[PDB]
């Protein structure tokens, strides 16, 4: 019925981002309700399809030989539904690397098994997708405080391995969140908290950083922004919807041939920032992509 039902999902409105709310318990009217999915379609295929449909409306940089890394890509099924959707969405020839604590079989060019902290690379990336979630998050024993774990690795990976002009989509929930990650959103040309319509009944959202500027554009207090996110979710019920899944005609990410250039930290002027903010520039070298997984040697 609602207009947003034909959208892939709903983004946090700007006025909610500007509030100064205190963290409240998340209480969704339809909490737990399951979406009606097309016959035989997995929830994670539907969810990533809606995330990609929403990413098609942003100013993403899409260079030739694009580099994409996907954390938390394995499922309890032993397969990678999200990786299959990203590879369908990304231009042919896009280098796609995925990873998970648990073994799984993937359509990615390379798969690394182990804690994300064991993943290393000197290369910079154009897009970082994370669906990581700690199962222990369900054990809500204390106050809802900023979480460390894989979030400290994701924040460091963005600050050191994300190309300027690059973007990220990091999954959060009411209890799976990190204040520093929200603060990093202020280092992008634009950001939002996006909720898929197939998972409207979950506190889940993807924190999207659009076009990395490598410097703070706006100052964001993470504790306040997560409280603002929960306030938005608690006061704006979203009707479950799978309508956008039925129209895949414009699904593939548009090839923009975005320019790739190498620049010192002193060459980043207002004119360069302007190009980064429109998805027209990626700053990194075009060297060979090399990744590794640290192995702990024991008896």
């Amino acid at each position: 019925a609602s207009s947003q039902a034909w959208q892939p999902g709903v983004a946090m409105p700007n006025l909610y981002k500007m509030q100064r709310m205190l963290l409240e318990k998340c209480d969704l009217q339809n909490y737990g309700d399951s979406a009606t999915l097309p016959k035989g379609i997995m929830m994670n295929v539907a969810k990533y399809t809606q995330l990609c449909q929403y990413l098609n409306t942003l100013t993403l940089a899409v260079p030739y030989n694009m580099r994409v890394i996907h954390f938390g890509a394995g499922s309890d099924k032993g397969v990678a539904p999200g990786t299959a959707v990203l590879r369908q969405w990304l231009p042919t020839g896009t280098l796609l690397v995925d990873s998970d604590l648990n073994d799984f079989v993937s359509d990615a060019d390379s798969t690394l098994i182990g804690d994300c902290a064991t993943v290393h690379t000197a290369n910079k990336w154009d897009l970082i997708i994370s669906d990581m979630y700690d199962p222990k998050t369900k054990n809500v024993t204390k106050e809802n405080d900023s979480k460390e774990g894989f979030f400290t690795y994701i924040c460091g990976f963005i600050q050191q391995k994300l190309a300027l002009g690059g973007s990220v989509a990091i999954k959060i929930t009411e209890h799976s969140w990190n204040a520093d990650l929200y603060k990093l959103m202020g280092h992008f040309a634009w950001w939002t908290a996006f909720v898929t319509n197939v998972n409207a009944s979950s506190s889940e959202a993807f924190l999207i950083g659009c076009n990395y500027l490598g410097k703070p554009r706006e100052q964001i207090d993470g504790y306040v922004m997560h409280a603002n996110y929960i306030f938005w979710r608690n006061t704006n019920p979203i009707q479950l919807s799978s309508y956008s899944l039925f129209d895949m005609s414009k699904f593939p990410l548009k090839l923009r041939g975005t320019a790739v250039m190498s620049l010192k930290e002193g060459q980043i002027n207002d004119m360069i920032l302007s190009l980064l903010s429109k998805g027209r520039l990626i700053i990194r070298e075009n060297n060979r992509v090399v990744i590794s997984s640290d192995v702990l040697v024991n008896n």
């Binding site: 097309p38 035989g40 997995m42 099924k77 397969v79 539904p81 369908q88 079989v105 359509d107 005609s249």
Partner: protein
């Protein structure tokens, strides 16, 4: 030599497992697509037509799913990193369909399910 002589007819074993009433391998990743594709068997992006379902390749490969070596040269997988089209009538068992059927090297269609090079 002796390790190769012993190895393990996995393709043959799956057909016997189904004949004994075994439940087909599940969790093959079905993709959302227009269903207005070329209908070729193995493609870089989903190409299902109105009579097909498109699936992530790795999830429909017996060797990938069972964590065993591939027969293809140097263990090269033909489904991993690609999308396989499966007739809607056989979409209940994608692993069984890819094993029992073969792709036409000329038109790129499944032999007996799209290939008409005759």
């Amino acid at each position: 030599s002796t390790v190769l002589s012993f190895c393990v007819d996995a393709a043959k074993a799956y057909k016997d497992y189904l004949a004994s009433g075994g439940q087909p391998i599940t969790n093959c990743v079905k993709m959302l697509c227009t269903h207005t594709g070329t209908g070729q068997a193995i493609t870089v992006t989903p190409e299902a037509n109105m009579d097909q379902e498109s699936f992530g390749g790795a999830s429909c490969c017996l060797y990938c799913r069972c964590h065993i070596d591939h027969p293809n040269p140097k263990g090269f997988c033909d489904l991993k990193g690609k999308y396989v089209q499966i007739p809607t009538t056989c979409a209940n068992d994608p692993v069984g369909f890819t094993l029992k059927n073969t792709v036409c090297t000329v038109c790129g269609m499944w032999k007996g399910y799209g290939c008409s090079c005759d």
